[PDB]
Ligand binder design. Structure first.
Ligand SMILES: [K+]
Ligand SMILES: [K+]
Ligand SMILES: [K+]
Ligand SMILES: [K+]
Ligand SMILES: [Mg+2]
Ligand SMILES: [Mg+2]
Ligand SMILES: [Mg+2]
Ligand SMILES: [Mg+2]
Ligand SMILES: [Mg+2]
Ligand SMILES: [Mg+2]
Ligand SMILES: [Mg+2]
Ligand SMILES: [Mg+2]
Ligand SMILES: [Mg+2]
Ligand SMILES: [Mg+2]
Ligand SMILES: [Mg+2]
Ligand SMILES: [Mg+2]
Ligand SMILES: [Mg+2]
Ligand SMILES: [Mg+2]
Lengths: 25, 141, 184, 220, 82
RNA sequence: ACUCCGCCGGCACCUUAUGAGAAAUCAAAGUUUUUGGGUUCCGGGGGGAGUAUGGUCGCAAGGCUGAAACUUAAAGGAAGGAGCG
RNA sequence: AGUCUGGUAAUUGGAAUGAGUACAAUCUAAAUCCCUUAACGAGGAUCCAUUGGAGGGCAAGUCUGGUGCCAGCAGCCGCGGUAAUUCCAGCUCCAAUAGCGUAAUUUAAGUUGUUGCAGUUAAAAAGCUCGUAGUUGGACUUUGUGUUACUUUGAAGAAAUUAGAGUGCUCAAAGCAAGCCUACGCUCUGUAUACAUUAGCAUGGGAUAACAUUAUAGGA
């Protein structure tokens, strides 16, 4: 996978964690 | 380039201190994570045979490597121990005391056996080598 | 505390770094068979001893020739080599110590001298004679084949007074055969 | 038989030149291996270091050629290295022996400390490079032996070196560059200008100038 | 070179470049040894000459021509040539 | 303004090896086992991973700092005369 | 052809000898072991040497039977799918040998680089500049009671260990003993010496280097 798009995939995955963790705080 | 000053003793010493961590061998011994391994820094360990299992040999080889799931008596951790030699699995019964050792690569997998880093040395207080060569027999029956 | 814990002991040989070098295996077996050695260990300790002597000489040679330590220990080392027949009075320099070889030390063994003085038929015959209490160096019986003879002692190698080959009574084989012959 | 095609071949055939040092002094190329067999022939000793197959991809398959590394030397200050590639193992060895003779060099030897006995070690620190391989030779005391790997050790023995310390850096498993780097530092033993060479040079006529009349006459 | 007794221990003594003083090794095939003939009052070759050796290093640099010119401008004034 | 000679400074280019290099190539990427002018940053097989976690900055997007378990025997770089080959 | 020398055989011969066994003495606080020694004690001298290997690395077989990608081997590369040098066996051979195999740390590692490594493309120059601490700083002063570093020599420094002198415990690892002659004893017998970072103490040296100082001289 092109490195730029793998970087994009990880950033999306980090947003969900950032939102899936602040949901319970 | 390198710092060369006669009064640069501190910087050279502290630079090497930081850079030794980049070495994998150095970091494996000074991290302290060896104590969390199933042997916890020991050369051998006794355990109880939970079940006799077979593991598919890794490619391009094709075989069923005879292993045994073992729970270590001293810490209760479960490991897979390869049973060497031909027909030595017949000498091992479930819920039996076995002495385990490393596989020879210091916690790394060996050969075509996937994810196996231990081997069986003794069973019921008798070495598999003695049983294989018919020197001794297991103490039962 | 145990007093016995203070007794010193050390190692007398090192194994080779490369175990299966064909050239070395050929040269070592030639010395082993030439001098009737028991195994490679006997040859390795002689090499170990030789290395110690050469190392001492090299350190001395690196010092100034006027250094008192160079003069004192250098003379002692040369005196030690002369007393065992390794060096000659015409080779009184540390540089000649560096030229010593394993054959020089193996030639001073009691086994080698018992054979090269005519007392034994072969280098392997000398080995058995020594271990069987047939040889003496002066007044003392020696049953160690690795005994390193001194120049002042080489002329006193003879058969033991208790041996059948040195005036003693015949061994138990001849005596029993004589007894059997008498019974007839 | 031998029919020399070079001036040196004729003089060596005639017998005017009777030592390799007379050729080395004038840095003359040696293009006939029979010259080496006539001057140090009986004392030489060849030895095949390795047989190396090399392959060239082709439409039908892969063409395999064999590459032979040969070292020659009398063990008294002369050593040569030859490498030849050929389709047959035997042909490569025979040609490698010829190439090794044609490259024979003089190897200067010196003393570690006191000049007692015959020279036994290199006269100075010398280093040789080939590819990524660098071989260093440091003078060693008598009896130290050749402290080197198998490949340099074989070359040093044929050159007549008895005691030397060596160290290596780079890909020594590339035998071609390892042996060549060893041979590279052995030829530098005569290139380093020590104080004992400070004496002014006394030139002598070259063999081609000394025997011009013999060379002028055609040989039949 | 010389043993403690005095015997020579070198195979040979390599020549030194007349310009740079570098040793000339056995494989330096770019090195040349040159002879400059001597003349008499009339200007005829007398069988005498001066020898110059040049290493491959200096000849490859292109400095052999100027090096030879200087070495001859001095030597000829010493042996009477002109 | 143009023509000719030269000096200092600058962006570069061309030829060449007596140099260096695994080579491509480089007048510096030279003056390195014949190893030392001064100083800062920074790398230690491939992955896991610039991920988890803690801290800090930001309105946010994210930035800076930054692991381990585990996995793997390769991943990667250059490619008679001439070239280490 | 010849005859001198060397090598093999569970052939044939007489010799040698300690493992063992044992009168004894000795040893010891008493025993025991060792040392010494009467008798006894070897021919397939069964008084039977083992542990790992034999594709490469790496010394040693393209032997024979079995198995057929199974069972297994294999630290790594790999071997095994019906003609296996690699598995299971026999034979033979190899290495070490009364030892050898297997499962933290040193070496190899100039893959931690002070000595001594890297950073154009292989892992690696911060996007750029400023900037404090740090580190590093041109030349010059005599050649022909300002304070320090450095260097020289010395003093003080536990032994044991290490290096090392002397010494024939039968050798050796060791030990610190012994030797000399034959008397009512002797060699005053020996039990040396070096090393020992850094800091501290004290002499000599003053190149190199650091800090301090200088013109309303509070000068000599
Ligand atoms: K360091
Ligand atoms: K310009
Ligand atoms: K060609
Ligand atoms: K070094
Ligand atoms: Mg620099
Ligand atoms: Mg260019
Ligand atoms: Mg450097
Ligand atoms: Mg990495
Ligand atoms: Mg060609
Ligand atoms: Mg087999
Ligand atoms: Mg082999
Ligand atoms: Mg078969
Ligand atoms: Mg194998
Ligand atoms: Mg590493
Ligand atoms: Mg590196
Ligand atoms: Mg890239
Ligand atoms: Mg990169
Ligand atoms: Mg200055």
């Amino acid at each position: 996978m092109r490195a730029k798009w793998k970087k994009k995939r990880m950033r999306r995955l980090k947003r969900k964690r950032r939102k899936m963790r602040q949901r319970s705080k | 380039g390198k710092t060369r000053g006669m009064g640069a003793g501190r910087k050279l010493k502290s630079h090497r201190r930081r850079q030794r961590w980049a070495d994998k061998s150095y970091k494996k011994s000074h991290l302290g994570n060896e104590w969390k391994k199933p042997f916890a820094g020991s050369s051998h360990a006794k355990g109880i045979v939970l079940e006799k299992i077979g593991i598919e040999a890794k490619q391009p080889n094709s075989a069923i490597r005879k292993c045994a799931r073992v729970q270590l008596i001293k810490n209760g951790k479960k490991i897979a121990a390869f049973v060497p030699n031909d027909g030595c699995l017949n000498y091992i019964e479930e819920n039996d005391e076995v002495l385990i050792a490393g596989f020879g690569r210091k916690g790394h997998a060996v050969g075509d056996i996937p994810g196996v880093r231990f081997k069986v040395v003794k069973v019921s207080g008798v070495s598999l080598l003695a049983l294989f060569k018919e020197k001794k027999e297991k103490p039962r029956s | 505390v145990h007093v016995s814990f203070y007794r010193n002991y050390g190692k007398t040989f090192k194994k080779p770094r490369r175990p299966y070098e064909k050239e070395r295996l050929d040269a070592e077996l030639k010395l082993v068979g030439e001098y009737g050695l028991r195994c490679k260990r006997e040859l390795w300790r002689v090499q170990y001893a030789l290395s110690r002597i050469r190392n001492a000489a090299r350190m001395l040679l690196t010092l100034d020739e006027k250094d008192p330590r160079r003069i004192f220990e250098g003379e002692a080392l040369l005196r030690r080599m002369n007393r065992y027949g390794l060096l000659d009075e015409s080779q009184n320099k540390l540089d000649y110590v560096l030229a010593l070889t394993v054959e020089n030390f193996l030639e001073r063994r009691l086994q080698t001298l018992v054979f090269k003085t005519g007392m034994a038929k072969s280098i392997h015959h000398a080995r058995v004679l020594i271990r069987q209490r047939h040889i003496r160096v002066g007044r003392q019986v020696v049953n160690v084949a690795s005994f390193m003879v001194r120049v002042d002692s080489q002329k006193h190698i003879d058969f033991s007074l208790t041996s059948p080959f040195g005036g003693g009574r015949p061994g138990r084989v001849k005596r029993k055969n004589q007894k059997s012959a008498a019974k007839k | 038989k031998w029919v020399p095609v070079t001036k040196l071949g004729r003089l060596v055939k005639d017998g005017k030149i009777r030592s390799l040092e007379q050729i080395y002094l004038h840095s003359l190329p040696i293009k006939e291996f029979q010259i080496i067999d006539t001057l140090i022939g009986p004392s030489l000793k060849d030895e095949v270091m390795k047989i190396m197959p090399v392959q060239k991809q082709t439409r039908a398959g892969q063409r395999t050629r064999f590459k032979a590394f040969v070292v020659v030397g009398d063990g008294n200050g002369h050593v040569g290295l030859g490498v030849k590639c050929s389709k047959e193992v035997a042909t490569a060895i025979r040609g490698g022996i010829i190439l090794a003779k044609l490259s024979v060099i003089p190897v200067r030897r010196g003393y570690w400390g006191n000049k007692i006995g015959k020279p036994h070690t290199v006269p100075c620190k010398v280093t040789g490079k080939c590819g990524s391989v660098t071989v260093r030779m440091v003078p060693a005391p008598r009896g130290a032996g050749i402290v080197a790997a198998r490949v340099p050790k074989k070359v040093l023995q044929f050159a007549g070196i008895e005691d030397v310390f060596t160290s290596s850096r780079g890909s020594t498993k590339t035998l071609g560059n390892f042996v060549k780097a060893t041979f590279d530092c052995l030829m530098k033993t005569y290139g380093f200008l020590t104080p004992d060479f400070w004496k002014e040079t006394r030139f002598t006529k070259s063999p081609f100038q000394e025997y011009f009349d013999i060379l002028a006459k055609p040989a039949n | 070179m010389q043993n403690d007794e005095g015997q020579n221990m070198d195979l040979y003594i390599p020549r030194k470049c007349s310009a740079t003083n570098r040793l000339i090794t056995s494989k330096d095939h770019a090195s040349v040894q040159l002879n400059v003939g001597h003349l008499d009052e009339s200007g005829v070759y007398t069988g005498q000459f001066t020898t110059y050796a040049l290493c491959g290093f200096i000849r490859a640099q292109g400095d052999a021509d100027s090096a030879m010119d200087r070495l001859w401008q001095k030597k000829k004034a010493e042996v009477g040539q002109q």
